[PDB]
Amino acid sequence: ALPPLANFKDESGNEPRTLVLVIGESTQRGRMSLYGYPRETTPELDALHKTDPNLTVFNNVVTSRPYTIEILQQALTFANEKNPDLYLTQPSLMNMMKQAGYKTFWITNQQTMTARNTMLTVFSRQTDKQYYMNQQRTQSAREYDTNVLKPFQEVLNDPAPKKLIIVHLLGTHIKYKYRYPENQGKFDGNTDHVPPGLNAEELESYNDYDNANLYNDHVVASLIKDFKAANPNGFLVYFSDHGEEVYDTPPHKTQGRNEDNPTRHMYTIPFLLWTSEKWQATHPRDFSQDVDRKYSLAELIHTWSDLAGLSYDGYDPTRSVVNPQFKETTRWIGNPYKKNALIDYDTLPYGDQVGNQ
C-alpha cells in the first residue's frame, strides 16, 4: 500500500544480528529507584546498571501523548505532534525493518482483538510472526508479563540471520493490583515515602503501583538477562509509551491520565538501551554524553534508524538522541487534533521533584 523509503542504505554490515524493542506500558520515570525513587521498586535494573557498562540509562525522555494508541501512532512511525497523520502516508518502524531484510516478530501480553480492526492490531500484523499471549476475557483475568519470556526464548532460537523482536508489555497499566501475583505485594501496608493526605483507598492504590513497578522491573531485567544469555549480536531498547499520575503531584488527589489537565508524571518515561558485547566491538559508540539530552518519544524512529545504521530520504539525524548532530527541539504535548492546543512540556510545574523533567 505504501512505497518503500527512498535512497535506502544499510551501513551496519551483513553479519547476523538480533534487535529487540520492548514497549512498556504506563510506567512513569519518577517511581523507579533507577531514577531516584527512594523505594526500591526496580532492584534488578539498578544492579544491572551498576554491574553492566553497556546499559545506558536516559534521564530526560518524555512521551508526547498519555494514551496508548495515540502515542504509538507517533513513536512507531514518522508522525509527531506537528504532523500526527503520517502513520497513514509514510511507512512505519516495522516496514523499515522488513525493507532492511529483517524477519520481524511481535510478542504481546495486551489483549488484542484479532477479529477486530483496532490500530494496535494493524501494527502487530505488519510483522511476519505474532505471539498473542493474553487472549482473555477481561479485567481481573490475571495474565502477567512473564508470559512473554517463553516465546521470547523461542524467537531467539529462530535461525533467521536478521531478526527484529518487538515485545509489548501490559507493564504497569490499571488496574495495578492485577499486574503482579498476590503474594508479591512487597509494599502492602507500607507508609514510608508516601505523600500526605491519603485515605485507605488512595494508599492501597499507591502501593499497588509500586508493587506493579517491582514486577515490571523483573520482566524487563529478565528480557535483558535472557537476551544476554544467548550471547547475541545486537541491542535492546526499552521504553514506556507514557507515564501515569498516581497521587505524585500536589495536592496528591489525582490518579490517572488526562491530556487536557497534564502533570509531568504522566509524560516521564524510562528509556533504556542495552548493547551486546559483540555489537559494541563491531560498532564502537560512546553514549555517556547523551544520557541527559531532552528528548521526545515522538521521534523514536530516528534514534532507531541511527542505531540500526539506516539512512533514507526523510531520515533526520538531528532528532536522534544518540547522534553527534542531535539538536534539541521543543518537546510538544497536548492533543494534536485540536486547534493550537500544543504546549511545551517544560512549562509544566513541579519539574524539580526527583524523577521529573
Q: Report the interface residues with Zn ion, using CB under 5 A.
A: 25, 68, 241
Minimal distance, residue 242 CB to Zn ion, in Å: 5
Contacted entry of Na ion, Zn ion, none for residue 320, CB cut-off 5 to 8 Å set by kind:
none
Contacted entry of Zn ion, Na ion, none for residue 74, CB cut-off 5 to 8 Å set by kind:
Na ion
d(CA 325, CA 86): 24
Nearer to Zn ion, 268 or 305 (CB): 268
d(CA 239, CA 189): 29
What is the DSSP-derived secondary structure letter of residue 147?
A: G
Q: Which residues on adjacent β-strands are paired with residue 162?
A: 17
Q: What is the DSSP string of 251-285?
A: TS--EE--TTS--GGGTB--EEEEE-HHHHHHS--
Contacted entry of Na ion, Zn ion, none for residue 18, CB cut-off 5 to 8 Å set by kind:
none
Nearer to Na ion, 28 or 92 (CB): 92
**Residue 240 found at the interface with Na ion (CB under 5 A):** no
Tell me which long-range contacts 97-101 makes (C-beta under 8 A, separation of at least 24): 97/19, 97/164, 97/308, 98/126, 98/128, 99/4, 99/5, 99/8, 100/8, 100/10, 100/162, 100/308, 100/310, 101/10, 101/162
Closest residue by beta carbon to Na ion: 74
Nearer to Zn ion, 27 or 127 (CB): 27
**Residue 275 found at the interface with Na ion (CB under 5 A):** no
Contacted entry of Zn ion, Na ion, none for residue 263, CB cut-off 5 to 8 Å set by kind:
none
Minimal distance, residue 116 CB to Na ion, in Å: 24
Contacting residue, 27, 74, 95, 275, with Na ion by CB under 5 A: 74
**Residues of the shown chain interacting with Na ion in the complex, contacts defined by CB under 5 A:** 74, 77, 79
